[PDB]
Write a protein that binds this ligand. Sequence first.
Ligand SMILES: COC(=O)N1CCN([C@H]2CC[C@H](Nc3nc(Nc4cnn(C)c4)nc4ccn(CC#N)c(=O)c34)CC2)CC1
Length: 266
Amino acid sequence: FHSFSFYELKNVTNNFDERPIGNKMGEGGFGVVYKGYVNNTTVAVKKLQQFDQEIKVMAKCQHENLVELLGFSCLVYVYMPNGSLLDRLSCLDGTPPLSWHMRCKIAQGAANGINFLHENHHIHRDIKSANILLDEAFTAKISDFGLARAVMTSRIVGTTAYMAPEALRGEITPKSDIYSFGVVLLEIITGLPAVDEHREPQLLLDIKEEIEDEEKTIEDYIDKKMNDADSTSVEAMYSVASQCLHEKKNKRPDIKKVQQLLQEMT
Ligand SMILES: COC(=O)N1CCN([C@H]2CC[C@H](Nc3nc(Nc4cnn(C)c4)nc4ccn(CC#N)c(=O)c34)CC2)CC1
């Protein structure tokens, strides 16, 4: 990794230009992110013990489905031209809806990235669609490893709309990453945010119970902003999401099984 000076990265971001159309993209995991440059190589600058673990994980953990760390001073990464899966599911800033075909590759790519992390005995601890970034080919890239660990804790961290019941109780397990990935799969099927105060149910993970109790079908919840979804592959992704969302952690599939079920889907 390239060691930058805080004054080097100041110029690349036009004196940390906070005005968006400027250089500010938005806030992201304990800091702000700005669009910067290193010749033509467009970069993302993360203006934040806390930032020392990110480099500690990014060092050994190199994979096609993980964001690439370039250097630091601030943390610098290759700028993902298609931003977050969360923003792309909401068509933020006029972007066209993602097709079912694109959603399947993104789901498969995100699962490959989690598999690499679990193979290398790491727990992400904050799997969510805001942390799934998309490159030039809409390849899924897992980001924000600040909370990542390589068990119980007093400092409960994560996004509550995505957290497993045992994670909300203080447990640290890769099985909690599977539950959170289940919430991501529902966001992909439905195009709905994981939590919405203006909704019944308020939490997306609660549609699992609604379908199980036959008050609604998966077909009632399929994102209407696609024209290429087929009931077979949609029900097959929903089946993976449902298995990931088991209240009991040990009943949940491991990432390799999830990866295998998503591969069988296409
Ligand atoms: C209502 O609008 C809002 O306030 N929003 C909109 C903006 N949204 C976020 C803001 C943070 C963005 N983070 C990133 N973006 C981009 N590229 C990019 C964003 N947008 N586009 C078009 C292209 N590349 C990278 C590369 C690496 N890392 C790792 C780190 N550190 C990133 O985080 C990263 C993701 C979208 C939040 C809510």
